Design a protein around this ligand. Structure first.
Ligand code: HXC
Ligand code: HXC
Ligand code: HXC
Ligand code: HXC
Ligand code: HXC
Ligand code: HXC
Ligand code: MG
Ligand code: MG
Lengths: 260, 260, 260, 260, 260, 260
């Protein structure tokens, strides 16, 4: 549609990548109500589209996302935050079945780090910094700033970042485990598009099952996790792309997956 | 009070930091019954004091804490261990609501690493060493040596340190995620005091809520943890420090928190 | 027995190490039915033997283990996979009480990386490459390739390796937390044997209790994990090796453990 | 709206009860796609309405709900069920924050028992019957037929009902713990409306908090459950209805809750 | 000590039972600060005494306990309730290692039921009534009134009692699974004393281990619970009372336990 | 084989039921090493047999199972319990995929109640009695006596039965939730055989999936439990018996399941 806060387009080879660029160079990409609504609409459109296989979330060259609009949730009370239409649609990023890649090429503070951690793959540049400055305004994160950051990085560094609001570099985030690959600030979008193409080049149902299996590592135990993994591996024998890949590996050729 | 094994003082800017220094060079700060009792008393005093906002735990320059006194628990039986009189007061460090910073200097083996991991922020010196020598004396850790270490560092290195007792440097601990920042041995206490001042400069109730949110990552699942984080973020709207910080951020000024 | 796919021998000082070398330089150590059966038999023999205190798993110089045999599981169906003897005896590696050291040399794809992660200690060389290329053929990991890899390395890198199948180096594995030490390829087996000797030089029952305590960090919560750790520490006072080691530490001598 | 399968109306004194009656006597209230869509729309309408405080789900005088439409999902496959929009909008009943009362006045088999157990209060008539006949058609429950039934009734009776499909009376369901009250078939709707009025006469936010606290008993542990309960009890001191109720209890008068 | 709100005494055969009677008829045994302090002191005294093997909690003939004092927590704010000064010493009843028997007589509303649910054995009278009247004043339970009640009784009846504040009889409580034995109100104290004597006649350490094993059924999964139960059963062989009872069963004589 | 302690036979219509009768009247069916070994062998044989679809466990007319042999584990120490020679093959009853029915007649104390609760369906006679008399000999249950009994019956009654060893009748067990249905002592075997026939008359793979779904209610949460249930329901569409039954239901005929 005519999105004013974001720009959703079809990039990549053969138009198989859904690029959502936060276009707002006036408030460091403040996650307001309209921006979040447009982001959710674009995510739903890319999920319902059969051509888009992967989604790539990218911000500006100076700030990825500074979080929610502090100038909007200021005059809010306990009732208007516990039962209202404010700050409710924040879990739509984790409900999609297709993989989402977060390309952080700048400042990612508050809600930005949360949206980055809610994705599957986190690509950051050299001039990218992550922090939790909520403690600077007498508030705490509310979208996984203390849950995913602790389980992915650690207890000590997460405690420090939450209680002090200190900014960490991309090298420290890669050494800890926050991000997976450091790319230049000019070719970060290109590497994200290439990764999305490599992901979308496989069977969509198998990719979704693998994503669910990986996400089950933070909601279940090790024994039950392995049991569910075995169950999904056994259920994967009901598709046609599996036998196609097996025959391609046996005959030493390329597997032509048909998403079935 | 007149503590003989430890020294509890009030340091930092405006006397807002509680410094507990282990004074026992003849035994590498052996965690005996009297030392643990004095530590618990100092923690309770710093928790009941409204001026102290953060606590800093520091040992000696040659060794932080060599663990429990093996010479005292030598002539013990199975019946004497379930009798709640010998080794029960060990979880009080995890019962305090104010953040505790561990300044590790020198040898930190057994109980030292456990007390360091039970804190929120772990600061180690350039010559700091962590290990679990319990397997060298026919015992096993009992204060998080096999629970927090495995979740913070990993499975392989924790298994190696538990089954072999090998020592690790501060660089390896930072690479694996045990510590968050490496400071010199001569300026570690200063950095810990500065971090405590940066923590004690914000709202105490918000800091406690953030600490609880971070600690809820090892006891709950991802969805339940996110829901509890949302509930706490909504409850933060009932305090005045949140509104004060938001107004200060909007007006571009310094937020004056009153811990309310 | 007359193993046709592996070589099980007794190495180390006083024959206290059980070395299982995958002898199959024709399919990159393809984990077929016979190879897995022989591996399980060797593990059971080393577990029943009182002299072997630790087991060392090692593959080939070019590749540790390519994974399950694709040519065998090609013409299989859902009903045929669910209720049969196809891919069922894969959890025996996690049922043994003695520590198992994984010496990975070369490629570790699919079943290889899973079997390496199911062990306690993971040792790799400079020319080591871990990956999970199940998505390239239309399948997913099914033996802990998405559960242990996510909890030990991280969410982002695990998602990337599962959805793309990229090759990671041993340095990145040590930085993330997959492997513990990086030894030369020509001396990795010697280092693994030395580690197995250092592990088997202690009390076997205490080593098993410590292994169970460390494994309980992924199956239980933090509070219940600490409770079970305290219970096991209290139960360790019923053996003679504990008192022997304590008396040796007090008298400053060597502890002569008797595995009792 | 103009519904063709259900009837959603406002019953009770002062129009505070939302009555949803399944109007389909020709198929025993078969849960088809249109019926589920209309039910979700009615639930959303009653949730967004500020006057309706409680919802009452009621079926027919002979059959409450005979499960999903078997004739519609007959010619379906694995891909048609997994990667499509077939049998997906079934958790919305668990997403509403207002209490929902299930009035079973007849046959509740398959999806009917699942929808009844997904509600908060279950009222069954004298002729009400509960069973799991999926095993009679080669399928299994998929909306809590094996999760909530086992935790609310017991392992033995749930196993029996799932593996045999045998029906149970209202007396056995009340004795086991499936239902709370047994009312005649002529006054069941009246008792349901009275219970909804008794629920919709208090503070809506406190009712939602209590509902979340009760629902958290099947998602977390006992210690973390009690911690979350304490946190919610502390957060309840931020509303105006609590102080009004306390003042009314002290002054021995009636509390005029304003839902704030 | 000279308790004013409660009466703690040593009843039973050979003074092996600790009886705590709530003496407050003018307020239906309102759980105020002084009453809770005296109860905690009596519990500590009975726990430190080696002769008392079991504790029996009993209230008045007209009402067991009407809960906390609403007149004291009326003019309280969020900051006052969140601080560790009001409503904090409520988990001590769950911290004792000796079994506690709850004798319920008359009205048991709010905490009077919550404390009753925090005990091991719940003995109710013929004129006993359990309810949760928190929604009538605008509050919610906070001491395990929505966690244990839901797991023990059920989801539907707990939801009804929380959202409506309805009173249930002792027969309905036993049918649902709240209490274990119904005794007359004139001889309930005698039956409780007899049960405490039957409990305090066995090995105290084995009784404590069994209590921990039973309490560990709501904190972790079934497999981990069974493994911890096996570990505790294996550790029980390190005592002398186990072998004494086994020899007494073999030699057909009475087992003379020595609490060791 | 020539089983001396038990008797395994093929009963039921068309020999589709596996009946294992405990033959040991001189010791009240003491669960010794040989008896447990024969039971495990019979269970494995009935699991590998394609004709048997359900297993029925039945004891004697005067006593079902009086637990493990106390006269055999008397002269055992702490070191003899952590080995792999005594009391290890007790979890084989929960590893089978086919349903197991427990016909309880007479006294079922200690291991008998544990083996009964480890089954899916528990059928008890009019004279059946359940108790946990381990506390009478200074021991504790170790095979689910404090884990499954607490979750299936409740906390209070389980605590009472564990700390006092009191016996309960079949009526109290059915009222609490321990047993499913009560049958006469002379026709209990016939009802068990009829239930096994009704269970085996369906698709074996679907029955196994349903059993796994029901067993998952004690190992995972409600959300992940429902997710796994949905996944298994989606995977059920990959079988032929599913479509056969869904077609026979529409055609109003008998579904001829082919176990595929
Ligand atoms: C469920 C909801 C999620 C829960 C978690 C949260 O609480 S989310 C909210 C938490 N987020 C944060 O705390 C981040 C706060 N942001 C900052 O502190 C700082 O902006 C910064 C560290 C990023 C550095 O900023 P700069 O040094 O570039 O300078 P400046 O602040 O003036 O940025 C330019 C413009 O961005 C605006 N701006 C920046 N962040 C903003 C935000 N989170 N909300 C609204 N507006 C913001 C400034 O007001 C300013 O507006 P003008 O153009 O008028 O000058
Ligand atoms: C809840 C309970 C948690 C679990 C409880 C535990 O298991 S804790 C116990 C676990 N074990 C440990 O932590 C390791 C024991 N500690 C060590 O071995 C040391 O730390 C070390 C490795 C640096 C070796 O020491 P050094 O090379 O500096 O030389 P030395 O051994 O003589 O140490 C100096 C002095 O400290 C004493 N000392 C060292 N560790 C001690 C300890 N844990 N308890 C008491 N005393 C100790 C020595 O006896 C000696 O005193 P004198 O020479 O004057 O006689
Ligand atoms: C419960 C079980 C868990 C479920 C999860 C899984 O395990 S699912 C499956 C896991 N993933 C895999 O198995 C894929 C593994 N792929 C590889 O190992 C390969 O190394 C590679 C494709 C990356 C290419 O490297 P190379 O060129 O060095 O190896 P290449 O395959 O071309 O040829 C050398 C020999 O390797 C053997 N080889 C490699 N993988 C094999 C396999 N899975 N089964 C049999 N043989 C295999 C071939 O026999 C081949 O000989 P010839 O070709 O001459 O005959
Ligand atoms: C995510 C998905 C969750 C839900 C998935 C599930 O749980 S699976 C769906 C669960 N349902 C089942 O397993 C079986 C459901 N069947 C019943 O409930 C029925 O009460 C019964 C057959 C057992 C008993 O019914 P009666 O004997 O009283 O009467 P009768 O035999 O004529 O019932 C058939 C009539 O009702 C309709 N009918 C009944 N159940 C139906 C169903 N599940 N789907 C479609 N139609 C159904 C038929 O169209 C038919 O109408 P006509 O006369 O026009 O032909
Ligand atoms: C973490 C903290 C714990 C969590 C739980 C809570 O805190 S929530 C608090 C839980 N408790 C409750 O919600 C309400 C408890 N009980 C009731 O409402 C009862 O049903 C009832 C008042 C209707 C009983 O009616 P009766 O006819 O028996 O007696 P009557 O109506 O004449 O007056 C009540 C008398 O008992 C006392 N009384 C009753 N409940 C009381 C209470 N919660 N706190 C203090 N006192 C109470 C009054 O002193 C009063 O005496 P006077 O007439 O002299 O004044
Ligand atoms: C996971 C590993 C184990 C888990 C934990 C456990 O289960 S430990 C086991 C739990 N402990 C128990 O169940 C207690 C055993 N229960 C009983 O013995 C009986 O049921 C009873 C005393 C309660 C009531 O029985 P009766 O009065 O009808 O008959 P009697 O008193 O003669 O029972 C003893 C006779 O049965 C035999 N007998 C009965 N139970 C036995 C047992 N568990 N071990 C060995 N022998 C047993 C004796 O050899 C003896 O036969 P003789 O005439 O030759 O002398
Ligand atoms: Mg790491
Ligand atoms: Mg019940």
């Amino acid at each position: 549609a005519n999105f004013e806060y974001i720009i959703a387009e079809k990039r990549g080879k053969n138009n198989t990548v859904g690029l959502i660029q936060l276009n707002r160079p006036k408030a460091l990409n403040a996650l307001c109500d309209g921006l979040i609504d447009e982001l959710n609409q674009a995510l739903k459109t890319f999920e319902e589209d059969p051509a888009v296989g992967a989604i790539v979330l990218t911000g500006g060259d100076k700030a990825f996302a500074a979080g929610a609009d502090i100038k909007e949730m200021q005059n809010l009370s306990f009732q208007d935050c516990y039962s209202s239409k404010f700050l409710k649609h924040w879990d739509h990023l984790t409900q999609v079945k297709k993989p989402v890649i977060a390309a952080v090429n700048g400042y990612a503070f508050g809600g930005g780090c949360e949206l980055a951690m809610m994705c599957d793959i986190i690509y950051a540049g050299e001039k990218a910094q992550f922090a939790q400055p909520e403690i600077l305004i007498g508030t705490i994160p509310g979208a996984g700033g203390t849950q995913r950051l602790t389980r992915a990085v650690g207890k000590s560094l997460a405690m420090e970042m939450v209680l002090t609001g200190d900014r960490i570099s991309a090298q420290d985030a890669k050494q800890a485990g926050l991000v997976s690959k450091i790319c230049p600030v000019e070719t970060l979008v290109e590497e994200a598009i290439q990764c999305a193409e490599k992901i979308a080049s496989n069977s969509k149902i198998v990719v979704a099952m693998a994503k669910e299996s990986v996400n089950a590592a933070f909601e279940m135990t090790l024994t039950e996790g392995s049991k569910l993994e075995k169950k999904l591996f056994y259920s994967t024998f009901a598709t046609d792309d599996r036998k196609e890949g097996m025959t391609a590996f046996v005959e030493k050729r390329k597997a032509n997956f048909k998403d079935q």
